[PDB]
Amino acid sequence: LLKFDPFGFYSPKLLSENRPEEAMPFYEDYPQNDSHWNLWEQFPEDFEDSNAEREAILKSNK
Amino acid sequence: KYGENISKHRSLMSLYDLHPQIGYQSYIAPNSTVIGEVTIGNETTVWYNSVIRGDVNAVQIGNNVSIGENVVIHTAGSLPTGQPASVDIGHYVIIGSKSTIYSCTIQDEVVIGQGCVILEGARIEKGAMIAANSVVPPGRLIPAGTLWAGNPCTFVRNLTKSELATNIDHAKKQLHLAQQHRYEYLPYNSAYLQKSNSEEDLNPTKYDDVTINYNFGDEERAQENPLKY
Amino acid sequence: GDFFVDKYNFSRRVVDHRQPYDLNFSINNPVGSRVWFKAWKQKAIGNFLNLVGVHYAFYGAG
Amino acid sequence: HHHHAGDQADRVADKIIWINIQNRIGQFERISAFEGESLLEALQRNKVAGIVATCEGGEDINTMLEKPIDPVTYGPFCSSCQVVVSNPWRNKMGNLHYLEERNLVRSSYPTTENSRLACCILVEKWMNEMIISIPQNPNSVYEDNM
Amino acid sequence: FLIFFLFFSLLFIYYLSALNNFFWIILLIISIIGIFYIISIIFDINLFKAFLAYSTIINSISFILLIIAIIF
Amino acid sequence: MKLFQAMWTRTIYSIGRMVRETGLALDRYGCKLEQDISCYEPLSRHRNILPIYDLVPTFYHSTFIAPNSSLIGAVYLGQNTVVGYGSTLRGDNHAIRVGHNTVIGDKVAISNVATLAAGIPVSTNIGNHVNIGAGCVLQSCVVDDNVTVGHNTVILEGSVLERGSVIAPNSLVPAGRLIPSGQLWAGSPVRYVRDLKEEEIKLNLEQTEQNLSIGKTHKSSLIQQEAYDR
Amino acid sequence: RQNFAKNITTTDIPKDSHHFAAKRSGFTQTEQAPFAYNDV
Amino acid sequence: FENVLLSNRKNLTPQESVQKVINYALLQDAKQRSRTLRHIKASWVIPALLFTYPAWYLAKGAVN
Amino acid sequence: SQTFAHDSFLGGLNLFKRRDPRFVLDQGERPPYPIINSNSSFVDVLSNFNKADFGLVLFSAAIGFPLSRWVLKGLTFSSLNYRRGLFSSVYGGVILWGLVLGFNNSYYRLNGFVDNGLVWKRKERKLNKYDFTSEFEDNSFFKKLRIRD
Amino acid sequence: VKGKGSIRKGIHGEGFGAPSHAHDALIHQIKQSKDTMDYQNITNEVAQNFANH
Amino acid sequence: YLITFNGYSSTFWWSHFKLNNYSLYMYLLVIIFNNYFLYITEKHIKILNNYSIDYFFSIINITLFIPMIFLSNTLFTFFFLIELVSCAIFYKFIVSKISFKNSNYKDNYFSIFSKNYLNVLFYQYWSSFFSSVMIGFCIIYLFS
Amino acid sequence: LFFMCYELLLIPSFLIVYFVSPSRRAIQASLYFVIWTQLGSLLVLIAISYIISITNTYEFNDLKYFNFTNSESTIIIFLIFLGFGFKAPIWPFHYWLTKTHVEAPSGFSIYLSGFLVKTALYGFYKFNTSIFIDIDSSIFIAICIMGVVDSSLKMWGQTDLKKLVAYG
Amino acid sequence: LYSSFKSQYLLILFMTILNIFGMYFYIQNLRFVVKKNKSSILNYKNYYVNINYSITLNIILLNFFNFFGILFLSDLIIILNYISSYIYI
Amino acid sequence: MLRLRLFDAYEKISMTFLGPLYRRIGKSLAQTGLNIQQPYTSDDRLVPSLRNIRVTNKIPSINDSEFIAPNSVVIGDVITKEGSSIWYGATLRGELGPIEIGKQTVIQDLVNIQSGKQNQKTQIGDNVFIGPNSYIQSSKINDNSFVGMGSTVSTGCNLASNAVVAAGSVVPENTQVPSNQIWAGSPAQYLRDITPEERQVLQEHHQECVQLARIHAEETEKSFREVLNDFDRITAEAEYDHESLALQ
Ligand SMILES: CCCCCCCCCCCCCCCCCC(=O)OC[C@H](COP(=O)(O)OCCN)OC(=O)CCCCCCCCCCCCCCCCC
Ligand SMILES: CCCCCCCCCCCCCCCCCC(=O)OC[C@H](COP(=O)(O)OCCN)OC(=O)CCCCCCCCCCCCCCCCC
Ligand code: FES
């Protein structure tokens, strides 16, 4: 209980959230709150998301 | 003998009344090959460039199985212990890419790492995990809910219920990817329209009596699998 | 020949090798023709030889 | 298993329970089973003849293979997985469940006092070298021949 | 159900309605005996086609009760 | 307006799919009426360029793509990139980006995991002048610049191979690992072996350039035999 | 299981990249490979 | 627009190069996810606009 | 409601025009049209054959061909001779059914059940007290199926 | 094997049943000795048939 | 034919059959349901063929005569119509397929005894016999 | 329409218990819930059938313009009380509630105890208020008080918190 | 409803007994539908499961008239009462 | 017979008129639907046969092989002897170095025979079995050698006659594998001398694989009409009674 710190305010928490083992996949850690009341991913308004890579490659091939 | 421009490869092939069977929502990649008596389950995804030979013995595969690319599954015909030498794969089995399966039993919720060789007589029990680039020696038992790694594989550590549920969830995620890949294919093959008429096509040297058509009643049959012949 | 449009052969045609064995039999010729009459006479004579009393009781009584 | 880190895997041959069978044609078989499975599952995996297994192991919840058997269980749903066990392992099994006995006595073919239902038998380590006989079981419905 | 049982009911309703003074008691006795005879039996079967047949039988007894109410 | 354009695109795509299905069904029906069997030929359905709706593979024409390879979904190949025979690049989940002058061996499977933690890209990014041996399995990795990967090597998700690194054949880089620059790593659990020398670096660069030239020769030979598109 | 996107676009995750320093030299023949991502 | 992956990053330390590649990959993944979400949400609004009034017509005709 | 003129080739379509959904009339109910021969014999019905019944036979012949083909669409493992024989038998059966329909139409015209070119001196006076169909039929296709609205 | 369903062929001969099935001693005797019985061999099947009778 | 049918509410062929609206509606309803079930049966038979021509010919004979029961104006003609229908139903039960092609290769050199066919025939035959004799006795005593 | 809307609450509830519940024992709990609540629904169905057949109407004012005899009113009140007490639940018809609450998912257990039983109460109130009943309600009062006592005396012997809340 | 209209309380009681017993007889099998995994009950034609679209459409129509058939039962009642009205007139 | 004449006339009309008309309309509709769906779609192609690919003057000599998979890849100077088998997904690149496959040699599924050096002959002897998912690199594999599935024979390896590499083993570069010895492990090391029983097992495995390749060659090399006849035969067997089987 003393070392328990899942939110990383007292014990620093990796963005990777865990060190994967040399025999396990890099699965995320289960969150403390498993709520599924999540919206779709929120992007900022006026977000430029055009497929610039594909457009550039097509321009080169054109 | 082997000189032609159009490939003769068929994804599903029979061998002397050994007909493969495939369940609903199962995606066999057109680049993949399934031969002999192979019973694929419902919602099973065999990815590209994978070979499944149920020729010398049958191969039963569970429902939510995901077989990766470059995976060779084949049977041995006989085992030293007298057990059935047929591949029996559990219902939520994630076989990693470039894997080899040689007439072994794999129970449900089993994860096989990429580049793993599971030899003859091996029994991977329910919930087990084999890390990538590992070889299970022939006739070896992997206890249920255990994590192994090595060549030959050695016990690493027991698996928690969270890890087991994570593997189960990873098994279920491939379904919608297979749905997208299926949706990219129309039920009617359009490749026949791109060929040129041949003398054999226009002038059949031999004729056969009219029998039941292989597509009889297909106007009433749902086109659930677009890759069906 | 081969009438390709884009990639589709509009003249694509593979003649079916599955035909009834009696496709060109004499009995399948239009009724009233000499070939059909020959085949039908043979069939009727064979049936009468197999069924003398049946033919008598059916056609003669009819 | 109580495996330790770095321990090698154990042989399947060392974990095999042997069932010696007398088939209806009076022929001696030797099949392999694993603890935790049912005798019906072992017999069907080994393609053992004589077991009709019309209901195919009964219900999937509150099964007869659980320890202890749930009181709300429906028990076996036919009398087609009948195997006559030998005396030692039959005594070790104990007394019949009431539903299993009801299904055994409601069989069109004669039974014995050592008769058990295969899908009601859970394979255990003490069932090694266990002798059973499998005379031909009755066919219940029109689809037993389908 | 559509022919045999329908003609059964019409025998009690239409064709032999003048004999309903004797039909009612026989139908009531048969209905009571069937209800109190099959309630236990429908719960000792273990076959799909037996389930279908007993569904048919239960519906037949219900409709016999209905025609008893009709001939009143 | 962007959602309206997406709706219009999907509506037009669905109308085209309906028209194509109707046409194929009509052709099959005429095939039936003609007593024809051309419609029943079990020709292979494999497509080396399989777009997942809007995830269309994109590559420069300088690339060599094996006819039996399978580029699915969002794949982005740089100039002169060589793709081996039987190699699969599944961009159905996330993009698979490959740099200029990169060689991918035969029977190489590259894919992406569903999700990863924060700061870890779920896309398989491969730098320029990378050489990948045959029989490799890459998952959501980041290989940067002139990296040599031995054959039968498995790179797991979250792995980062830095510029100028060599991984010996029949090895496995585990998930979330880092291979420092200018080092040789070997073994299924990858262990450090030695720092790369100038001779080794030059030999690896020469070998990957030779592989690029061999890929160009393969494309030239396949075009002549009518086994290559365009 | 959770399936949301950790790599949000509305803002940048506040991180400290200096707390953990990945090893880059002096590896032994039996040591494990370092970890690529060490931001906290 | 500059393609960081298809660029001359050899004038930097390997850590800087891999960090730039990671940042570029994250940005392009965000853009791709935005496009995929836009296309997915299009699969909702079209059925909502097209078939909702037929469904309401059916319900109204059946009820009142 | 108007009916197709009898003794034409569309007189058999009057069989599909019914003023009431009843199968038959009552015992003492007068038929819609004057009776020509209530005690009709088989040869009386044959003599009363006309263009309406011939048109019914022609309609059976025209619609019987696609129906026979549809029946044959389920035939397998059959030679060409048996296929042609089965088609001929089915087509002859449909034409015989058309002959039966024409015979029925002639019998009805004899009995006055359908239009026979005759009208009663005084029409039966009926009050359409219960009427759920007049407004529906006057604004729909079904005005052609119900006689006298 | 063509025309024999799931029955397979090994090296020194061809099987008489599906893989992992039960070899019948009576079938082996019939196939090997087509009509030759040196003596009326009383097997378990014959003894059980006599007992049933 | 039923839709275009016309006539008087009366009894035809020596009052052995009744042509009235209710009997004709019962005839039509029986035929309509027979058509629905035959349509579904065809859709099923295009999936897997476990039935022969004789089975569906027996079904054909049932559907032809089973609506004629509702036209009966007498218990005599009704008894004979149900005798014909019971013979057709016995015919249908007779032509059920006995053996199938299955993946059960364990029974090729052993005798498995399935008795459902004989049980069906026995019970149908004896129920028909008892019903027929009781209906005949009832007819004889109703004539009295 | 009142009776039908009362009757439409069974299928979604059984579907929630049968498919959303994680416990393996919840299948039998769903069966018990269905059979008990449907026996109560059958009793209420008999009562409403009496009401509709005797006075051919569907309006409470039309019920106000009609009087039921003593026997008919007694039968109606007994039937409605017993049915809505099957759904209430009342002693001894709370076995289904105990089993379901122990085995149902927590969300449905919140919804089952919180709301549906109140729909049963509303149905009973609407049915009994519109009909003149001349019998003594002491039997029904005794049944309700016996239910209260029986539920209260069993709270000490419950080590399961959800079953204790069910008894409450 | 008709038994109450005909004033048959005993017949109503026996109908209720039969209905409740048969109802548990039917819903008892709903417990058996729980399976540890998805089943394989479809015939295989051309190496894939044969799903008959015509039978599926028939089941769709029957399901519509089974779920929402109470909304349209009045027309069936009218048709059946009209048919039955000919029995004595 | 007027009915039969009408039947024949409509058969001729339907075929010779409706067939071509419906086919033309369907092809036009399919083409325009494909055009509408572009570019967010793909169409079925004609998959090239890559099992006889030549490079400049390097032309395969594989006509003696008893089985070559339709989806296998054989490029360049690859010379195989009589009875050779190359299975599904295998890749033999003779441009990077000559490949010499011996008599009765089995190269199983997804085996990559690729030369590490620019021009080095990869010489596999007679009666040699190579397991699936193997990787052979510029090696000399002598006669009657066994290579297990998932095995990697490196650049300089020399496998003597009757040498066994266990499945999953990776032979190090320049490693000489002696005769009648079994090696195993990711660093391949001498495991044990092979017993005669295991030798017989390996011989039977090789003969079984040779005959299985013969069967697969019989199956995979069927023409389109033969494949259609096989499909019809399978669908007929799906509905054949025991009486029909007895008749056959
Ligand atoms: C700028 C160009 C724009 C083009 C827009 C679309 C134009 C459509 C042109 C249609 C031309 C029709 C020509 C005559 C066809 C008559 C129908 C026919 O022959 O149907 C029979 C056939 C039966 O098929 P089946 O039972 O499945 O048997 C398969 C056998 N192997 O049935 C079939 O094979 C099925 C195909 C029938 C095709 C006609 C159906 C028309 C229905 C009305 C239009 C609805 C919209 C369809 C397209 C979607 C548009 C969003
Ligand atoms: C403005 C408009 C412009 C134009 C728009 C476009 C064109 C519109 C075209 C409209 C329709 C045209 C129809 C053409 C004729 C159709 C004939 C027909 O379907 O008849 C049905 C039949 C007629 O009934 P009826 O005449 O009363 O019966 C004989 C009485 N002598 O009825 C019967 O057979 C009734 C049978 C009653 C008994 C069975 C049914 C009730 C019991 C079962 C209920 C349902 C259960 C499922 C049954 C099986 C369903 C498959
Ligand atoms: S198989 Fe049914 S009781 Fe065991």
PDB file of C-alpha atoms in Angstrom, chain D residues 59 61-66 69-77 97-99 102, chain L residues 28, chain M residues 31-32:
ATOM      1  CA  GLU D  59     -25.866 -28.934 -20.535  1.00  0.00           C
ATOM      2  CA  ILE D  61     -23.758 -24.917 -17.261  1.00  0.00           C
ATOM      3  CA  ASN D  62     -24.266 -26.663 -13.919  1.00  0.00           C
ATOM      4  CA  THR D  63     -22.724 -29.767 -15.450  1.00  0.00           C
ATOM      5  CA  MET D  64     -22.490 -33.210 -13.869  1.00  0.00           C
ATOM      6  CA  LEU D  65     -18.677 -32.961 -14.030  1.00  0.00           C
ATOM      7  CA  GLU D  66     -18.467 -30.165 -11.457  1.00  0.00           C
ATOM      8  CA  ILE D  69     -22.692 -31.029  -8.530  1.00  0.00           C
ATOM      9  CA  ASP D  70     -25.009 -28.033  -8.360  1.00  0.00           C
ATOM     10  CA  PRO D  71     -28.473 -28.901  -6.968  1.00  0.00           C
ATOM     11  CA  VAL D  72     -30.160 -26.984  -9.813  1.00  0.00           C
ATOM     12  CA  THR D  73     -28.508 -29.167 -12.449  1.00  0.00           C
ATOM     13  CA  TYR D  74     -30.691 -30.930 -15.003  1.00  0.00           C
ATOM     14  CA  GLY D  75     -28.309 -33.890 -15.119  1.00  0.00           C
ATOM     15  CA  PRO D  76     -27.827 -36.097 -18.162  1.00  0.00           C
ATOM     16  CA  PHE D  77     -30.189 -35.651 -21.101  1.00  0.00           C
ATOM     17  CA  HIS D  97     -26.220 -39.108  -8.580  1.00  0.00           C
ATOM     18  CA  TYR D  98     -30.000 -39.352  -8.529  1.00  0.00           C
ATOM     19  CA  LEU D  99     -30.461 -37.818 -11.992  1.00  0.00           C
ATOM     20  CA  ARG D 102     -32.757 -42.014 -13.262  1.00  0.00           C
TER      21      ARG D 102
ATOM     22  CA  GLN L  28     -32.103 -19.803 -13.489  1.00  0.00           C
TER      23      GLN L  28
ATOM     24  CA  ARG M  31     -31.642 -22.140 -20.044  1.00  0.00           C
ATOM     25  CA  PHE M  32     -30.204 -24.760 -22.410  1.00  0.00           C
TER      26      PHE M  32
END
